Design a protein around this nucleic acid. Structure first.
Ligand code: ANP
Ligand code: FE
Ligand code: FE
Length: 903
DNA sequence: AAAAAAAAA
């Protein structure tokens, strides 16, 4: 039967007309073909064609054929009658009441139609091809189950008249795509990636502009020659679509380490070792783990290793995952610089990928006229970022690929053609570490090479990550009998893993010498007791005792406190003590409005960092901060005083001590004899005690084992970096360090709880997804999280006078905008930037279950993604001008300008 | 009680 064009696929926004189903199908088949040839990394075409075990050209046409079948489930009465249509020639298949989505219909029909073209009835390949297409709206379905000998009828396809039109369609795209014979094999992981491809295909050719265009040259009839014409036309008009969305490859020339970084006169020890021993190792899919200290050129090292592995695997794309949004911003700058120099592309975006990327003026858009590597409007969309040829963003963006959520197969497809580089792997907690492990496991099976950068890494984590990657590569998991692939890490050191054979190659094995790093003075670590008042720390004396030389002779110091309260206490006291005259005083923590925090930080690195010392602005000064100091802040301090924290974190903090001493530029005061970290700890009165406020942030046992490990050294300095990795390993490894068996077990139990939540959250192991994709998107009883915990909400403080009316400043000069200064009273981007710039992150708690109507944003705000979820915090200001502490959620708040938000 | 991330076709 020749095919009827009366059956549509699109109607919306089409100004009264309808695009035919066949035309969408051919379009979507065309896009997939082009995507295969012009978007896919060559390595990825290879990986896929191997799973099907056929040549690439065939694999392509198969894929294109499949793509053209994605919306066939639309050829039902349930879908068709959503608008006016003349179905009089089509009696039967009366409405069932099921209300069954069209993609669900595809996956229900395809298993019993495919065999008429060659597919093995009840085959694994047929099963997967139906399931995968059935999942082209981001949700896979179960394999169809039936009890009769007539599944088609059993599933609602009872009318000969309807069944004819669906086979017409089936043959129309089969023919139009060159009638590809069925592949022999197809596995789950490969199928899920292809699902991604099919989804990108649908999306590209569903753009209103592209549609209105094809709508000017519909086919006259349903003849083979006409549909052949339609397909070939859409074939031509798709590469244009790629460029308009900036999906074109960024390819980078092979290059030695120096040719890639010509501005570098004296390549690092780490860089020399990597560049020398790695090209011979990088013969295909592998994982590299570099673990080295801060300030050793890890970034350039990474790009190079990434460039090798990219070439070895025909994968030109890149994802760099960073721990924070800010570091992602910075790295996005470096990589883009690297791009410009390294390539000899106005249709390829270097995407920036995190939740605040839209409100970045320098990144977001306000064709062919474009800046190179610039964001396109298309990639700025939801779910599309990883489809950018190159991208840097938060690690959370990659981790979202292995969560059981809609459209994850899209993100999986995005990564599958790239080299993924995750930086600061030491920063990933036990919940994130299970997600990382599932990603590595899935990346391993998909042939994607990985570079893991870290600072020191506990050997067990190191072991888990490479074990995870090897599992994916090798098809099978780890035995109980099987030996561990990584039993030791060296800091500094690197490590190569071959995916094909599973050979681990330590840097030790290829060179007996240790990797030369910046030499530096060992770190003096000094445990000092503090009197406890009211289960708190009376740091008063000591602060005076230890800071005394700095008031006379000058210098730079930092005090690090476990909580924001304790951080605010210390500042206040420093101020009281300082009213008695030079030196300066600063306070940094997370509870400041953005604009303020981005300002405080800038001046603080301005004084204590490298471009400060170089420019002479470095003072003759004290900083008080919380764990924000553990983030990348360019600081060099002459003395550091810290509350006890876990050693990994202490040692992390202590890397701010004399950070740039090898620069030779800085003059240290006569009292700063050696680089020193002072570690405060409560005096006791037989397993160590710590403040409740401390034990709520860090598990008690960890603080105990850390104190015990440090006491044991009797004053002895920490040689750097020879002593570090052993400390890091030992705090967890040495059981004699924990004398509170009860506190220690709890610690272990809390860790279990976090890995457990994680396992609920993630998609199956690749081998569990072999013949069944349904578990990738299965969930019941909300949104799954990339990080553990109750999280944070963004608050905004508004001001109320006696009158009383709503203001944005204590001075009551800036009216609280009920509306937005855009046409229609709507908010703009640049509007949302001004509001968000004064928002404060606040940690979720009981206070949120006690909010009221005046804690919620006005009606106009709900229309805005960025403002809808804000919490409003009132602040009462007296008619004298003083700001009062104000109750919200069952407690009192006050946004002090020097001390940040207080509650 | 830290810090950190987080509308499709
Ligand atoms: N020989 C060199 N090798 C690598 N980087 C160098 C070299 N000489 C100067 N640099 C620069 O040193 C700067 C900072 O060094 P770097 O090792 O990156 O420390 P960092 O940025 O504080 N920590 P990280 O970014 O994680 O590596 C970068 O801008 C480099 O370009
Ligand atoms: Fe669809
Ligand atoms: Fe579609």
């Amino acid at each position: 039967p020749p095919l009827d064009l009366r059956f549509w696929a699109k109607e919306r926004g089409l100004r009264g007309k309808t695009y035919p189903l066949v035309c969408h199908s051919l379009d979507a088949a065309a896009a997939a073909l082009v995507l295969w040839n012009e978007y896919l990394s060559p390595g990825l075409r290879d990986t896929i064609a191997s799973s099907m075990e056929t040549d690439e050209e065939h694999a392509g046409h198969c894929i294109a054929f499949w793509a053209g079948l994605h919306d066939i489930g639309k050829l039902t009465r349930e879908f068709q009658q959503q608008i006016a249509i003349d179905l009089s020639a089509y009696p039967g298949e009366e409405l069932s009441g099921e209300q069954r989505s069209h993609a669900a219909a595809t996956g229900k029909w395809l298993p019993f139609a495919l065999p008429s073209l060659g597919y093995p009835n009840g085959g694994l390949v047929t099963g997967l091809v139906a399931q995968m297409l059935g999942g082209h709206h981001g949700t896979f379905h179960p394999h169809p189950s039936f009890q009769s000998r007539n599944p088609l009828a059993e599933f609602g396809f009872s009318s000969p008249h309807w069944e004819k039109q669906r086979h017409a369609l089936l043959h129309a795209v089969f023919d139009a795509t060159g009638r590809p014979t069925p592949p022999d094999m197809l596995d789950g992981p490969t199928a899920s990636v292809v699902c991604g491809l099919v989804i990108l295909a649908d999306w590209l050719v569903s753009q209103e502009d592209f549609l209105l265009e094809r709508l000017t040259s519909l086919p006259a009839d349903g003849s083979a020659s006409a549909l052949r014409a339609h397909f070939e036309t859409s074939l031509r008009r798709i590469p244009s679509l790629l460029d308009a969305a900036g999906l074109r490859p960024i390819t980078v020339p092979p290059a030695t380490f120096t040719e890639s970084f010509p501005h570098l006169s004296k390549p690092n020890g780490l860089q020399a070792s990597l560049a020398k021993h790695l090209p011979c190792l990088c013969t295909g899919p592998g994982l590299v783990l570099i673990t080295a200290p801060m300030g050793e050129g890890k970034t350039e090292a990474a790009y190079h290793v990434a460039d090798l592995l990219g070439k070895a695997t025909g994968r030109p794309g890149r994802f760099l995952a960073l721990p924070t949004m800010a570091t992602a911003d910075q790295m996005h700058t470096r990589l883009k610089e690297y791009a410009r120099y390294r390539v000899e592309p106005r249709s390829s975006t270097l995407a920036l990928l995190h939740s605040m990327a839209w409100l970045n003026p320098d990144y977001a858009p306000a064709l062919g006229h474009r800046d190179p590597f610039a964001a396109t409007d298309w990639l700025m969309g939801r779910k599309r970022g990883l489809l950018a040829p190159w991208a840097v963003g938060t690690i959370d963006q990659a981790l979202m690929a292995v969560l059981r959520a809609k459209h994850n197969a899209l993100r999986l497809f995005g990564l599958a053609g790239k080299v993924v580089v995750v930086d600061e792997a030491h920063a990933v907690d036990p919940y994130m570490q299970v997600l990382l492990e599932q990603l590595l496991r899935w990346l391993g099976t998909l042939d994607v090479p990985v570079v893991l950068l870290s600072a020191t890494l506990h050997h067990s984590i190191a072991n888990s990550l490479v074990k995870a990657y090897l599992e994916g590569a090798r098809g099978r998991r780890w035995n109980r009998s099987e030996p561990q692939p990584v039993s030791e890490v060296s800091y500094p050191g690197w490590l190569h893993v071959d995916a094909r054979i599973g050979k681990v190659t330590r840097s030790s094995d290829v060179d007996p010498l240790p990797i030369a790093t910046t030499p530096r003075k060992p770190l003096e670590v000094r445990l000092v007791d503090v009197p406890v008042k009211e289960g708190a720390l009376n740091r008063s004396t000591v602060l005076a005792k230890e800071l005394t030389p700095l008031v006379k002779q000058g210098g730079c110091a930092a005090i690090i406190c476990t909580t924001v309260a304790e951080a605010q206490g210390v500042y206040d006291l420093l101020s009281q003590w300082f009213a008695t005259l030079a030196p300066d005083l600063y306070l940094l923590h997370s509870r400041f409005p953005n604009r303020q925090r981005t300002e405080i930080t800038a001046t603080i690195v301005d004084l204590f960092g490298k471009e400060g010392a170089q420019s002479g602005r470095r003072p003759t000064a004290v900083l008080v901060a919380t764990q924000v100091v553990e983030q990348s802040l360019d600081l060099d301090v002459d003395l550091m005083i810290s509350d006890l924290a876990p050693v990994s974190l202490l040692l992390q903090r202590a890397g701010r001590c004399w950070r740039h001493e090898h620069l030779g530029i800085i003059n240290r005061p006569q009292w700063a004899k050696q680089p020193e970290l002072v570690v405060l700890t409560p005096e006791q009165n037989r397993a160590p005690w710590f403040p409740r406020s401390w034990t709520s942030v860090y598990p008690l046992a960890l603080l105990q084992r850390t104190y015990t490990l440090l006491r044991r050294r009797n004053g002895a300095p920490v040689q750097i970096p020879e002593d570090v990795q052993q400390l890091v390993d030992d705090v967890y490894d040495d059981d004699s360090l924990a004398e509170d068996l009860e506190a220690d077990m709890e610690r272990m139990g809390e860790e279990l709880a976090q890995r457990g939540l994680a396992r609920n959250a993630v998609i199956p192991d690749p081998d569990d997804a072999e013949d069944n994709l349904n578990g990738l998107t299965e969930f019941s009883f909300h949104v799954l999280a990339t990080r553990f915990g109750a999280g944070s909400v963004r608050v905004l403080c508004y001001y109320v006078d006696t009158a009383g009316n709503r203001w944005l400043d204590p001075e009551c000069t800036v009216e609280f905008p009920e509306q937005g200064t855009g046409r229609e009273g709507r908010f703009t981007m640049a509007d949302c930037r001004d509001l968000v710039a004064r928002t404060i992150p606040v940690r979720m708690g009981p206070w949120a279950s006690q909010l009221t109507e005046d804690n919620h944003p006005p009606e106009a705000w709900r229309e805005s993604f960025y403002l809808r979820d804000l919490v409003l915090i009132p602040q009462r200001v007296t008619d004298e001008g003083a700001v009062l502490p104000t109750e919200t959620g069952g407690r009192e708040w006050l946004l002090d300008p020097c001390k940040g938000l207080i509650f």
